[PDB]
Design a protein around this ligand. Structure first.
Ligand SMILES: [Ca+2]
Ligand SMILES: [Ca+2]
Ligand SMILES: [Ca+2]
Ligand SMILES: [Ca+2]
Lengths: 60, 60
């Protein structure tokens, strides 16, 4: 009568990667010496947000 | 996953040399003989301040 191939069974899921691993927002400052002067000053900072299940980051 | 170069460790210090090794301030006097006379007189002194971790000085 009917001979089934016994293959018509399926299960399906989805995957996505919609975000980059890091986000960088800058809060740097300024360097204001006189002409030819020597000095040092703190510039500011830069926030590096870490995204989903990211544990170690290697940057350049 | 991530292969660290194991180089991103730093320690920093500063150095400066903002003063000259010696300071000289003068308290000399005057020589007041007559015309063609022969004599000798004390002139005065000159203070030679010695600066940070200076132990031996050679002057000209
Ligand atoms: Ca992870
Ligand atoms: Ca004479
Ligand atoms: Ca004389
Ligand atoms: Ca010395």
């Amino acid at each position: 009568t009917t001979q089934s191939p016994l293959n018509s069974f399926y299960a399906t899921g989805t995957a996505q990667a919609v975000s980059e691993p890091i986000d960088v927002e800058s809060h740097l400052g300024s360097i204001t010496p006189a002409a030819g002067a020597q000095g040092s000053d703190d510039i500011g900072y830069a926030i590096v947000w870490i995204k989903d299940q990211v544990n170690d980051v290697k940057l350049k």
